[PDB]
Design a protein around this ligand. Structure first.
Ligand SMILES: Nc1ncnc2c1ncn2[C@@H]1O[C@H](COP(=O)(O)OP(=O)(O)OP(=O)(O)O)[C@@H](O)[C@H]1O
Ligand SMILES: Nc1ncnc2c1ncn2[C@@H]1O[C@H](COP(=O)(O)OP(=O)(O)OP(=O)(O)O)[C@@H](O)[C@H]1O
Ligand SMILES: Nc1ncnc2c1ncn2[C@@H]1O[C@H](COP(=O)(O)OP(=O)(O)OP(=O)(O)O)[C@@H](O)[C@H]1O
Ligand SMILES: [Mg+2]
Ligand SMILES: [Mg+2]
Ligand SMILES: [Mg+2]
Lengths: 7, 510, 275, 511, 5
């Protein structure tokens, strides 16, 4: 995870 | 074959070619001067209604004749001279005296009820009314007026997400009475939003169909499968019958769109978030940026929809809190209003709280925007981003929002694959150019800035780890040896911005 | 071209234009005052029946002349003055008076027209009778009248479930004679009740078909597969033939309905539960 | 039958032939002087309108008579002499004068005709404006004019990748008014880019369709399956309706294109990178090489889009650094501009650095070029290459760029009398302009810089160091045998002169 | 040789 599903 | 001018004449004078005319009267007078063929005349002579013979007469004519002579030399003889006089008047106020064309032979027939018809059929959206941003809609209309002469051009109405561009474009084609009728004959407004590679073809498929007559919408072939060169040729074909046509391409993301727009020598208004797509076009490119709503304009917008104006000091402060939080942004401001239920300044500050402790999801609402919350919008803007830019953005959380800060102060949290860190600036620039996520400001010293809406997006959205890691990765470089920027004698202590850091640490202890 | 008054005159005086007249007598007079052409006149001069010459004279005449002058200034000279007097009297009852008839009644029994025919064909339900809620049905009719001028607008007749909204809408379009005929030309009443995401497109598919002529319901294509931008365009297309049309959207649940309704610049009455 | 002049007369005098005339008066006179027939005359004599008798008289008259005599010798006698005078005056302005109008202008605004309509419909791209290369676009237009008489011919506008050929072709057909209208009737501009073997048939399928009328694009069949001899025949068929037509074949890779073009007796302009495809054609072949943008044209190109010109010496040097690196190349220069953000010489030198330590990928940008970076372009140019030439090229990294060097000095790194090396290096410059030939003082070749930093970050990291070693080896083998000036043969033993760049290359591979 | 040419 680096971006909670891009937003 | 004719062209755009002579056909603009044949198109402007259509209410008339419908009120008094008949193609049977002209077929005989025209087989002689060499402009038809016995199938042309077959197709036009046996047709049940007249609007059929007329649409075939004006189509076949726009293709067949070397000039617009043998149609002036006919409305004359047929006692329908009231037609050929109008058309010769237009061609004279076109070849000899230019400019005079818009005031004299085109305007005296404008009608605020024909417009709505033309807008509707061209799928133009219903302009906003309870508030109009004067300046921008005005400059749009202006810069469109300046170009109606031009053969093909790009107008880029670019801004943030929810920044209000499309609505402004809706108003700009709805304000004046000149743009449609006087400066341009027709409007075709199509929303893109294409992400797939097939989207850029499907769009222009629906252009091709936005153009086509009510007749032969029946005949639509299996065009879904047909080359690009052919959809393109089919358009520039069917584009003859369309003199001065304006194209709004609402919400362009892929520069491939723009490339088609530029191969097809189209006239385009363009709303988009990523501004760099214009590098796709080697051409007349002109730009209008929809900035964040200034502090006074926000007031205007609120009054505009019935919001009670402050009295106590901590009420004007409540509203400056709202204006600061939603760093001048139409859409989240609107959601804000729509969600203020009782209307009290009180519940407005309630929301002002809700925004810090639940992000944009605290005020997400049903709004004229296609989106529940500005985060759904910024979503895409963040997906499209260069992977490396995705990284830079992912880290710009751990900054102070609504604070102007140096590049080196950024080089600390921002990634990079030596001693000159300018690469940071290049990335942060790409980052403001492409969704207006940052904010560039050249002098006194090279500094960027992250706004508040664009921050609370990232807050409740980036990986909970990367926050605390960016905070520590900041506290490392942090040591080595107001309307005023922070000096280089004092970078070692970011403690000035401790408040907005104590907040991310409290956030990252949950 | 003429217009509605002068064509109402050429249409009104046909029982008359058949008993005594001939276009050839006028052909020269129209070949003369420059309002005809010798092929036009050819078309009308060699015609077997008189009804031929008359139907061609009345079709052909309307395009060339700026007005209905060189036809009054003829029935005079031809000893057919009983015609030109009727027409000059009528032209006086229109040039000389700023008042005629408005949209109202002069061919009565709108009882099978507005009530029977238009309600039934617009699928308006058979209004309730044994009790009518005055206040509400009344305010619906009122607030509909105030807006008939407008190009597009939403009226939300919203309430609890089973609270009686649709019935009130049934009555507001079935009581008066104004809403249908005076204020709006046609009625389209469609039940939504859409919950799936495919429902909101299918609805406007059945609008599009509520619109289409009795001819070409046979020709109905496999329209199920065609883009939304195209269904939308086919509607605002087929919507040319529909001047001032009212839309009842009975039982709306999804705001997507309302969004299409607002892209299609429709005039909408809406019964719904969620406000 | 009549002809163009006499029918131009019968067409010109129609506004006139309608106000006063009647064919029946002439029917007997034509039934008489033996130029009509009593059924012809029947057809024209019982007709309701006069416009009927006139349209039939003007259609019917043109087949029977050898000329337009028995119609002048009639308008005279009929008191309609105002007609026969116009026609005799015109016949005098054609029988008595060997001069009229030629293909030129008398209905002006070819600006929407030739520019708008024909260019757009022939899919010609929207010509560049902010800079025009005079010499080249000019010679294209010239050499096209000289050949408009010819029935079929090849013009090869060949150069490096991104060297600017297509743009120049865009401009040569968009500047003048002669090429379209005067010299050629129509334009067909088609992008090839075919690599598969099925591409070369599909191309001429879309030619065939570029030709077909606006009518019957609806009728387009499942033409995908029909022989080549038939597609070829359908084209030379539909090519009847197309007098003097010009063909631009933008971006040709396969000589099969050129072969079809030469079987179909077409008139072709050709932008391409590989020059040898012309050996496919046995014919009037003419060539125009798009050389690298000279340093001064590069200045012009810079100024043209608003770029500030130098002052201090190490700024003009910085920009000669940029011009040297992108060894005169339109496209990468443009990408460079698009990426120079603040516009400063400073950020320009930033890029000058970025280019050496990240190759062409350091300045790759959104550009009017179909390609993100020139490396994406050269990609193909490298794929098409003969496997052995792919090798020779792959090894030519370890040379000095922008230096003229001997064949033997090359025999050390290049695979296999070693003249054969020269043959490979020849094929190699001909086919994408990857090298650079220079006949005397001594048969020597040269590798430019763009064509180098392509290979740097592209060849196998090992093969760099291996070519460097294989060179220091044969150099010293040659050692065991014992500016505007070429490197002498007493001194090949030390390539150490170029130690500077050799030391950098080395650091690249060895890490 | 040539990482994807
Ligand atoms: N002039 C205005 N008057 C009233 N409301 C507005 C105005 N401009 C914007 N808004 C509100 O803000 C929202 C965003 O405006 P708009 O739809 O133009 O966004 P946008 O610029 O197209 O953003 P995106 O490109 O992300 O779609 C609107 O849906 C509307 O609710
Ligand atoms: N005059 C009246 N007003 C309201 N309801 C009535 C009346 N007469 C009978 N009813 C009964 O009330 C029921 C509900 O009426 P109606 O269908 O208008 O509800 P609704 O407002 O449409 O609710 P929903 O939208 O949930 O269907 C009717 O089916 C009928 O049985
Ligand atoms: N006047 C000009 N001459 C050459 N190139 C230009 C000019 N103006 C801009 N350019 C840039 O150079 C790029 C390359 O031009 P062009 O497409 O003609 O190359 P090319 O010769 O077709 O190469 P290839 O055949 O490999 O595509 C253009 O896309 C444009 O960005
Ligand atoms: Mg938009
Ligand atoms: Mg209901
Ligand atoms: Mg090319």
């Amino acid at each position: 995870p680096l971006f909670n599903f891009l937003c | 074959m004719l062209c755009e001018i002579e056909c603009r004449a044949l198109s402007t004078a259509h209410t008339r070619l419908i009120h008094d005319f008949e193609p049977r009267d002209a077929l005989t007078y025209l087989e002689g001067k060499n402009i038809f063929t016995e199938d042309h005349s077959e197709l036009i002579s046996k047709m049940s209604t007249r609007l059929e013979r007329i649409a075939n007469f004006l189509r076949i004519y726009r293709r067949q004749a070397s000039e617009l002579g043998p149609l002036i030399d006919f409305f004359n003889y047929n006692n329908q001279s009231h037609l050929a006089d109008f058309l010769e008047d237009y061609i004279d106020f076109a070849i000899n005296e230019p400019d005079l064309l818009r005031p004299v032979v085109i305007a005296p027939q404008f009608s605020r009820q024909m417009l709505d018809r033309k807008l509707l059929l061209g799928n133009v959206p219903k302009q906003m009314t309870c508030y109009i941003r004067e300046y921008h809609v005005d400059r749009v209309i202006k810069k469109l007026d300046e170009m109606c002469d031009l053969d093909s051009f790009f107008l880029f109405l670019h801004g943030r997400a929810g920044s209000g561009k499309s609505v402004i474009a809706s108003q700009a084609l709805s304000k004046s009475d000149q743009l449609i009728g006087i400066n341009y004959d027709s409007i075709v407004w199509l929303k893109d939003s294409g992400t797939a590679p097939k989207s850029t073809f499907d769009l222009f498929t629906d252009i091709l169909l936005m153009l086509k007559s009510e007749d032969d919408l029946l005949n639509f072939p299996s065009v879904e499968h047909v080359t690009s060169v052919v959809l393109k040729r089919m358009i520039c074909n069917a584009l003859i019958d369309r003199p001065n046509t304006l194209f709004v391409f609402d919400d362009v993301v892929q520069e491939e769109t723009i490339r088609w727009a530029q191969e097809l020598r189209l006239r385009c208004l363009v709303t988009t978030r990523d501004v760099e797509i214009s590098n796709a076009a080697s051409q007349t490119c002109e730009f209008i940026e929809v900035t964040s709503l200034e502090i006074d304009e926000c007031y205007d917008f609120l009054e505009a929809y019935g919001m009670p104006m402050p009295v106590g000091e901590k009420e004007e402060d409540v509203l400056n809190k709202t204006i600061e939080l939603s760093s001048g942004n139409p859409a989240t401001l609107m959601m804000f209003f729509k969600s203020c239920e009782p209307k009290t300044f009180e519940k407005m500050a309630q929301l002002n709280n809700k925004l810090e402790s639940r992000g944009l999801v605290g005020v997400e609402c049903i709004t004229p925007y296609s989106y529940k919350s500005l985060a759904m919008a910024l979503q895409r803007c963040v997906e499209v981003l260069s992977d490396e830019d995705r990284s830079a953005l992912a880290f710009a959380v751990v900054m102070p929002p609504g604070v102007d800060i140096p590049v080196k102060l950024w080089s600390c949290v921002i990634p990079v694959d030596e001693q000159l860190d300018d690469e940071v600036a290049d990335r942060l620039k790409r980052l403001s150019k492409r969704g207006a996520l940052l904010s560039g400001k050249r002098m006194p010293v090279l500094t960027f800035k992250i706004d508040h809406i664009i921050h609370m997006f990232l807050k409740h959205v980036v990986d909970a780890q990367t926050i605390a890691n960016g905070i520590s990765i900041l506290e490392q470089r942090l040591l080595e040896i107001e309307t005023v920027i922070r000096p280089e004698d004092f970078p070692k202590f970011m403690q000035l911005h401790q408040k907005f850091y104590d907040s991310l640490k409290n956030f990252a202890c949950c």
